[PDB]
Each structure stands twice: as structure tokens, then as C-alpha cells.
Design a protein around this ligand. Structure first.
Ligand SMILES: OC[C@H]1O[C@H](O[C@H]2[C@H](O)[C@@H](O)[C@@H](O)O[C@@H]2CO)[C@H](O)[C@@H](O)[C@@H]1O
Ligand SMILES: OC[C@H]1O[C@H](O[C@H]2[C@H](O)[C@@H](O)[C@@H](O)O[C@@H]2CO)[C@H](O)[C@@H](O)[C@@H]1O
Ligand SMILES: OC[C@H]1O[C@H](O[C@H]2[C@H](O)[C@@H](O)[C@@H](O)O[C@@H]2CO)[C@H](O)[C@@H](O)[C@@H]1O
Ligand code: CA
Ligand code: CA
Length: 686
């Protein structure tokens, strides 16, 4: 199949995601609606159930609402069974309509539907070329009170009907009992509870194994991707070990939520996206777009800077999921605001790098403050709005113009209010002009592009007051006036003659797994794939087309590799770096070192004999380690993903800047479990 096919679970860059709050979309089956005090059929009470479900979804798919818009994937609420208690939060009654209050990860939320409804969902979607994504929220269960076990469901966790345990009398240590976080530090927000939600302890084998198994069921159910909730609140190493479980089994595109505020730029965030095995929701992009097009708290120069930076910060920028709003923010559109702002922001998003996501109702100009105000019921299924039509014209370019799905981004013209950028991939180009200035037109002269000589029609057809473009030789455009609030898309597509890799997934896996290589110009005849210097050809290459190649990772050593391909004639492609070859299946192990005292601005790190530990390269050591919560300085700890059942040699180090101090003595040693988790405790050797 081609890169653009509905069956491509490894790449979403050519897709347009439609984010849905199941309850709030469409109640296709009134019979599963909760009753009594947990239900509000008028949906005036935003904290109860409104009755939206899988069937409703299925209906919208079939009546053409989503397909008409050009949407190609849907991202829905966590489908697992939630607690049933209504919770009164100081007078207010709250239900688990959101699906974030899990009780049993092996069952469905009956308000959403049955396993059979889930399966129909998957089928209908697939039948209409739409991929399905689900939220997955393994950080916790539900709200609990340790000394008021009668409160809610005591954070009870079941395994397919079987009671594993509760927050009260947690002898098994299924949960954390460290209090609640103040979000003060990263370590703080990982090992303490979020609010009152019962924090799962991933270091407990039962929990570990349980979650790894639960996800396999859904994978088996045919899902196309996973959206992880609260990734900044779980152990990084654990999460990496979970990704390996997915990837080594049935890889799917996975992205997590790591909130960023305005002007916030975090290196931890970057690193996580570059090394965890998953990508992220692009808050940096979102926050910046809002400042520029919404709140006018920054200008084009700001947008441009976010674009260039992010391209450098993320190893796989094209995997970050962009948006203008979602369930954690006020709706982009403000009641009294010019609708053009929202339209421009959509157009911008649809044509920019990454994986675009659209919060349900956007196309309807829904307004609403924070939670739960941003979670109202979709007032209508009209395809007559301008927003609806914008998406309808642009979404499809992601599939037919690879410049959009995988091309670089380049500023060609800029001022405070205007931004003209070019996307390029192979012999494909797209040019976008945006004039945020709703009152002033702009004189555009000196525009130079990569488009071939000729005239170009605005892809939006003038919908947002775009115009035609005239490119002479040398790709220089002739002077033109860009309307106030003006938005235009111009483009050029043609066949790519040389192999060009546009994407790869998954990015991390053990040998033997099949990965997918997407792009153009691969030719129709099997060529060769290189993993670093190792060549792979013949049978191991399970499939080869012009736009997509499927190949098995050779059994090479664990490490990072560059990928490159050669066509049947031997012409090579561009390199695609940062591929991680796991040393084998992974387990999550907690490392603890005692009496490692440091000086200010000096931290302990971990290194060792396997790629998962950096192979003795200090520049690749794991850390810095933690020393507040679970263990206190000068005791340091850290959860790490390691090759299962392997005998590993390791050592700790103290780093400051790039200056390193090794532990003395001989390597510590150990053998990783075959499954489950473990804890290694040792003392720092001087
Ligand atoms: O001519 C090539 C030139 O075009 C763009 O510069 C614009 C500039 O952004 C506008 O603010 C205004 O000054 O017109 C200039 C064109 O004369 C590119 O931004 C620039 O990098 C490029 O060299
Ligand atoms: O909280 C982590 C913290 O640990 C390290 O600092 C030690 C410091 O070296 C000691 O002299 C002592 O005062 O306790 C500190 C930890 O509370 C790192 O130096 C520091 O950067 C890091 O954040
Ligand atoms: O370079 C690989 C080498 O790294 C580590 O050796 C350390 C040694 O432990 C330190 O005490 C210090 O002398 O620096 C050496 C780095 O060259 C591992 O201990 C060793 O097994 C490994 O081969
Ligand atoms: Ca229903
Ligand atoms: Ca946690």
C-alpha cells in the first residue's frame, strides 16, 4: 500500500485528526445512556453524561459529516471502563463522562458501548478510510481518599472483573502513597498523586504487566494509534519500556500530552520526544499560534522563531501533533471575535509541519472557557460554515502534496503581520501566505519561491480572500497585494525521480520487527535498505512500492542508526537519522545508588554495557537521577528501560556540564528480569 493508505498505522503526517469527546459528539444509542443523576439529556450540565457514544460516531461517519470535511482519523475518549460513582465536589456533582477515571482497563465504558460497538466503530471507520485513535491513561485509576475508603470507588482497580486492589489498605503497593504533587518539580509530579487521582505504581510488577497486557488487547482490537495521557507524570524509563512493548508487538503511532504554557520551552520535553519512543502534542506550536492569531501577544517574527526552533529541537518534528485548541484550553474562538482569526489559524495549521488535530466543533465556531466549558455538545452538523470549507479544501492536500506532509519549512516573506512560507519535498512545493492584519492590506514585493514559472490559483479559491500568483523565471513572484485578513495557498506537484524518504515508523524497536518507510521515488523494484552500514535486501524487505517500503530490522547491535535506501539502480536517498535499535525486549528497572554526594550543579548519572545505558558513553548517560521523593539525597534513583534477562554491567557518574567523574572500583553487575520490574540498590564506589 501507499504511504497515504488508511492501513498505514505508523504515519499520520498525511492525515487530519478530528478530536472527539465521545459523550459530547452524538448519542446514537439512547439505550446505553446513564440514568438518573448521572445523566443530562439536555447536556446543560457539562459535568454529567450527555449520552454521546460509539454508534453516534458511526452514524456521523456514514452520513458524511466527517468525510465531507476531509477528516481522515478520529481521536476518541479512553474506551476503558470507568468508575460509576457520582462525585460531589463541594456541592457539584461529577461523572466520569470524560473517561479519565479508569477502573478496569480490560473492559469498555458501557455508556460509550460494548466491545461489539467498538468493533463496528473500527470497521465503519476503516471502511471510510478513517484511522482510529484512542486515549490511554495509565497514570492512575480514579479519585481516592486513603482514610475515607467510602469516597468514590477508592481508586479501585480491576482486571477484567477481578479486583486487584484499592487505595485504602494498599498492601500490595499498587499505588503511590506519597501525598499530592504541587507540580513544583518534575520528580514531584511523577511520584505524587495528581490531585486526588490514585497514582499507579509502575514499579510494581503486577501493575507493570497488567498495563502491558491491557494495551495489547486494544491493539488486537485494531486501533490505529494511541494518545497517552499525563506523560509528564509517569516514569520516563517506564514509558519507554511500554513503548517497546507496543512496538515490539504491533506498532502504532503514539503521542502523549506534556502540557506547555505560554512562552514555555522545555528541554525535558524535547528529550522525551526524541528518546521515549513516542511523539507529543505540540503545545509549543499551539501556544504560539494563539498568541499570534488569537491574543495578539506576539507577532510573525515570533511564529517564525517557533517554527525554526522546533525544527531543530525535535528530532522528528513531523511527528508532533499540532492544534489550536483542545480539551485543556479555552476554545480558540471567542464569542465576540472575528471569525477570520480562527479560519486563518486553521489554514495555518493544516498547511504546517506535523500531524494536525482538530478539536470537535471548531468548524462550528464553538466558544467556551476552560473545563468544562470547552466540552459542550456540538450544536450542529452543518457543512455550510466557512471553517468547514476551509478544512475541506486543505485537508486533502496532506494526502496529495507530500510537500505538506513531509516538506521542510521556509520563511520567504515576513513582517509583523504577514507570513509567507514554503513547504518543499522532492518536486513538490506549497506556498502559503497569511495576513493576520484584519484591517490592513500588505504590499508584497520581493517574494521569491521555488515554484516553476507560471500562474497559480489560490487553492482556497478566494475563500479567505486569497489571490492568484505570478511567478516568473527564477521563481520570483510579481508584486501583489495581500488582502487584510488574507490567506492563500499556492502549489506545485510533480513526480519525484529520486528516492526521498519522508518518514519512518516506529522509530524504536528490537531486531526482527517490520518498520515502515515512507516517501517518494523509491521505484517499483526492490532496492536496498541501509541500517547504518548494514545492508538489507531481498526477502527481509517485505514490501516495496514507490511511496512505501516495509522492512525487518536486521539483527544488529543495539544503538542509534541512520537509515537510507537505494533504488534498484543503486541511487541512494537522503538519510533519516535517530533510529533506535533495541537490544531486545525491555523491562523497567529501578536503579538506586547510595551515598553519592555531589557539589552544586553536579548530578549523578548512570551508564553501562548496553545501548539502553549509553554503552559507556558519558555523553549518553542516563539522568540526571532523582533524589527527592522515593529516595533522598545523597541517595539517588531512577527508573530505566533495559533489555530483558540480560546481564549488565554498569556504573554511576557525576557530571557537571560535560565534565565527568567516574565511580571507582569495578563495574557493578546485574541481570535484568525476564519480565516485570526490579530494583537494584548499590553504593557509590569511590
Ligand atoms: O527578496 C528575497 C527576500 O525576500 C524576503 O524579504 C522580504 C521581507 O521579508 C519583507 O519584510 C520586505 O522587506 O520585503 C523583502 C523582499 O524584498 C525574505 O524574507 C528574505 O529572506 C529574502 O532575501
Ligand atoms: O534535587 C536535585 C539536585 O541535586 C544536586 O544537588 C545536591 C547538591 O550537589 C548537594 O550539595 C546538596 O546540597 O543537595 C543537592 C540536592 O538537593 C544537583 O547539584 C542539583 O543541580 C539538582 O537539582
Ligand atoms: O570506555 C569504556 C569503559 O568505560 C568505563 O571505564 C571507566 C572506568 O570505570 C573509570 O574508573 C575511568 O577510569 O574511566 C574509564 C573510561 O575509560 C567502564 O568501567 C569500562 O568497563 C569500559 O570498558
Ligand atoms: Ca447513548
Ligand atoms: Ca504518576
Amino acid at each position: 500500500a501507499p504511504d497515504t493508505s488508511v492501513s498505514n498505522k505508523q504515519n499520520f503526517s498525511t492525515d487530519v485528526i478530528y478530536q472527539i469527546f465521545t459523550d459530547r459528539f452524538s448519542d446514537g444509542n439512547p439505550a446505553n445512556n446513564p440514568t438518573g443523576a448521572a445523566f443530562d439529556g439536555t447536556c446543560t450540565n457539562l459535568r454529567l453524561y450527555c449520552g454521546g457514544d460509539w454508534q453516534g460516531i458511526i452514524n456521523k461517519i456514514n452520513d458524511g459529516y466527517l468525510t465531507g470535511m476531509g477528516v481522515t482519523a478520529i481521536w476518541i475518549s479512553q474506551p476503558v471502563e470507568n468508575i460509576y460513582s457520582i462525585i460531589n465536589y463541594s456541592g457539584v456533582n461529577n461523572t466520569a463522562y470524560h473517561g479519565y477515571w479508569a477502573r478496569d482497563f480490560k473492559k469498555t465504558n458501557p455508556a460509550y458501548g460494548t466491545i461489539a460497538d467498538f468493533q463496528n466503530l473500527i470497521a465503519a471507520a476503516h471502511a471510510k478510510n478513517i484511522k482510529v485513535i484512542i486515549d490511554f491513561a495509565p497514570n492512575h485509576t480514579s479519585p481516592a481518599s486513603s482514610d475515607q475508603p467510602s469516597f468514590a470507588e477508592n481508586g479501585r482497580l480491576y482486571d477484567n472483573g477481578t479486583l486487584l486492589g484499592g487505595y485504602t489498605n494498599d498492601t500490595q503497593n499498587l499505588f503511590h502513597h506519597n501525598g499530592g504533587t504541587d507540580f513544583s518539580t518534575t520528580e514531584n509530579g511523577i511520584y505524587k498523586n495528581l490531585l486526588d487521582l490514585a497514582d499507579l505504581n509502575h514499579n510494581n510488577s503486577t501493575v507493570d504487566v497488567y498495563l502491558k497486557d491491557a494495551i495489547k488487547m486494544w491493539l488486537d482490537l485494531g486501533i490505529d494509534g494511541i494518545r497517552m495521557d499525563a506523560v509528564k507524570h509517569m516514569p520516563f524509563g517506564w514509558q519507554k519500556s511500554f513503548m517497546a512493548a507496543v512496538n515490539n508487538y504491533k506498532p502504532v503511532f503514539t503521542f502523549g500530552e506534556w502540557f506547555l504554557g505560554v512562552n514555555e520551552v522545555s528541554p525535558e520535553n524535547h528529550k522525551f520526544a526524541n528518546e521515549s519512543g513516542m511523539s507529543l502534542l505540540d503545545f509549543r506550536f499551539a501556544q504560539k499560534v494563539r498568541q499570534v492569531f488569537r491574543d495578539n501577544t506576539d507577532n510573525m517574527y515570533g511564529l517564525k522563531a517557533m517554527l525554526e526552533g522546533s525544527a531543530a529541537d525535535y528530532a522528528q518534528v513531523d511527528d508532533q501533533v499540532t492544534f489550536i485548541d483542545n480539551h485543556d484550553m479555552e476554545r480558540f474562538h471567542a464569542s465576540n471575535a472575528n471569525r477570520r482569526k480562527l479560519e486563518q489559524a486553521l489554514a495555518f495549521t493544516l498547511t504546517s509541519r506535523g500531524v494536525p488535530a482538530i478539536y470537535y466543533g471548531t468548524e462550528q465556531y464553538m466558544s467556551g472557557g476552560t473545563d468544562p466549558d470547552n466540552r459542550a455538545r456540538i450544536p450542529s452538523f452543518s457543512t455550510s460554515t466557512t471553517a468547514y470549507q476551509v478544512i475541506q479544501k486543505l485537508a486533502p492536500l496532506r494526502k496529495c502534496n507530500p510537500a505538506i506532509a513531509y516538506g521542510s519549512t521556509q520563511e520567504r516573506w515576513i513582517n509583523n503581520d504577514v507570513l509567507i512560507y514554503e513547504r518543499k519535498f522532492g518536486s513538490n512545493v506549497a506556498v502559503v501566505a497569511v495576513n493576520r492584519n484584519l484591517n490592513a492590506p500588505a504590499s508584497i514585493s520581493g517574494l521569491v519561491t521555488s515554484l516553476p514559472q507560471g500562474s497559480y490559483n489560490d487553492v482556497l479559491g478566494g475563500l479567505l480572500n486569497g489571490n492568484t500568483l505570478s511567478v516568473g523565471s527564477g521563481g520570483a513572484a510579481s508584486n501583489f497585494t495581500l488582502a487584510a485578513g488574507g490567506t492563500a495557498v499556492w502549489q506545485y506537484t510533480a513526480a519525484t525521480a529520486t528516492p526521498t524518504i519522508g518518514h519512518v515508523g516506529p522509530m524504536m524497536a528490537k531486531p526482527g520487527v517490520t518498520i515502515t518507510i515512507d516517501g517518494r521515488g523509491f521505484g517499483s523494484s526492490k532496492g536496498t535498505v541501509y541500517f547504518g552500514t548494514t545492508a538489507v535486501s531481498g526477502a527481509d524487505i517485505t514490501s516495496w512500492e514507490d511511496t512505501q517500503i516495509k522492512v525487518k530490522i536486521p539483527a544488529v547491535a543495539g544503538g542509534n542508526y541512520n537509515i537510507k535506501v537505494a533504488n534498484a539502480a543503486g541511487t541512494a536517498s537522503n538519510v533519516y537519522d535517530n533510529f533506535e535499535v533495541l537490544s531486545g525486549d525491555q523491562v523497567s528497572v529501578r536503579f538506586v545508588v547510595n551515598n553519592a554526594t555531589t557539589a552544586l550543579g553536579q548530578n549523578v548519572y548512570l551508564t553501562g554495557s548496553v545501548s539502553e545505558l549509553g554503552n559507556w558513553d558519558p555523553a549518553k548517560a542516563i539522568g540526571p537521577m532523582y533524589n527527592q521523593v522515593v529516595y533522598q539525597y545523597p541517595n539517588w534513583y531512577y527508573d530505566v528501560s533495559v533489555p530483558a534477562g540480560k546481564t549488565i554491567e554498569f556504573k554511576f557518574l557525576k557530571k557537571q556540564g560535560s565534565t565527568v567523574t567516574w565511580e571507582g572500583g569495578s563495574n557493578h553487575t546485574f541481570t535484568a528480569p525476564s519480565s516485570g520490574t526490579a530494583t537494584i540498590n548499590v553504593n557509590w564506589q569511590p
